[PDB]
Amino acid sequence: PFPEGKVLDDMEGNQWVLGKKIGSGGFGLIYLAFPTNKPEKDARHVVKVEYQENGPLFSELKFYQRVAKKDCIKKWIERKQLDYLGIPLFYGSGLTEFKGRSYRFMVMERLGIDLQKISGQNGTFKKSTVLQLGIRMLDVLEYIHENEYVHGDIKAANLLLGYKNPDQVYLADYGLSYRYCPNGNHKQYQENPRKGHNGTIEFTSLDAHKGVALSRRSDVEILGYCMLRWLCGKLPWEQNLKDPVAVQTAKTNLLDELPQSVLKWAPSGSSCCEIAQFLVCAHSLAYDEKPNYQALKKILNPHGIPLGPLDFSTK
Ligand SMILES: CC(C)CCN1c2nc(Nc3cc(F)c(O)c(F)c3)ncc2N(C)C(=O)[C@@H]1C
């Protein structure tokens, strides 16, 4: 349906030539892509194409149009004095056709390998890497939250290294993202069972379990379960993933028994001291409360050591 050599036209008039299909990402097929004007030998762009009616690409497109502006991001980076922000570049979008049916596509920045492929036994990472990933994610979280959105699906499969830079990590899918504060108006707290248990069950927030519209605290919470999983190689609810209520109950039990619940869970020699503190910080937020990003980062980097290379020596 999208053979190598297919020419796609974006809304800005630019043309893109499809290369090899490198996989599926989110609710899309991912292809290497080249501009028709001065292409490099090695692709620096991808085309994300929908393969189904409706889908979350429209929602993801709107997220990029609203918060992922090159200009705005660079200005943010300048003001916050960051080396980089783990959000891929958006290049354009449009429609492509196959057998009289239209499909939405987006042209995105080509990234490197996803974190699931370079993990140690049962999807683990070195303690130092785990903490740096959290910090990078918090920076991304701070930016999108300031721009009225919450992610709702942070997991190793959604984290990829930079194409040219292996010491940079990117959160690469925003299909489940949500506008929690449209025009500066935070959503009210309201539970809804019929809209409950969304997201990746292993990592989804308790708010998600209860059918509550996602807010900033849910994002921080997910990041916390993520880090515990990356450092320990399992979660107390690993054998209960097919029962969402059992997972919710186990998450409530973990948070209610903090910090000893997390402090005992860790494997010997690699403490969950920072992560327990992080979770304590994360679980103390009110529903509409802005997270203390700076305080969370200091919990993950208590000695203020500069962020260096990402160590993936257990792969
Ligand atoms: C969708 C993710 C979770 C997985 C997609 N993904 C890659 N995506 C990109 N760029 C990309 C793709 C997207 F959909 C984006 O929205 C985006 F902002 C950037 N480069 C390289 C890869 N590589 C090598 C992979 O292994 C897989 C296929």
Residue numbers in the entry: 14 to 328
What does the paper say about this structure?
For both VRK13-364 and VRK214-335, the compound inducing the largest ΔTm shift was BI-D1870, a dihydropteridinone inhibitor originally developed for p90 RSK (ribosomal S6 kinase)32 which displayed more substantial temperature stabilization than the best PKIS hit for VRK13-364, GW297361X (5.5 versus 3.9 °C in this experiment, respectively). The VRK214-335/BI-D1870 model contains residues 14–328 and also has a complete P-loop. By contrast, in VRK214-335, both main chain and side chain atoms in the P-loop are in close proximity to atoms from the compound. Thus, the folded conformation of the P-loop in VRK2 seems to be driven mostly by shape complementarity and hydrophobic contacts between the protein and the compound, whereas in VRK1 the P-loop folded conformation is held in place by a direct interaction between the ligand sulfur atom and the protein aromatic residue.
Members of the Vaccinia-related kinase (VRK) family of serine/threonine protein kinases are present in the genomes of all metazoans and those of poxviruses, including the family-founding member vaccinia virus B1R1–6. Here we present the first crystal structures of the kinase domain of VRK1 and the first crystal structures for ligand-bound VRK1 and VRK2.
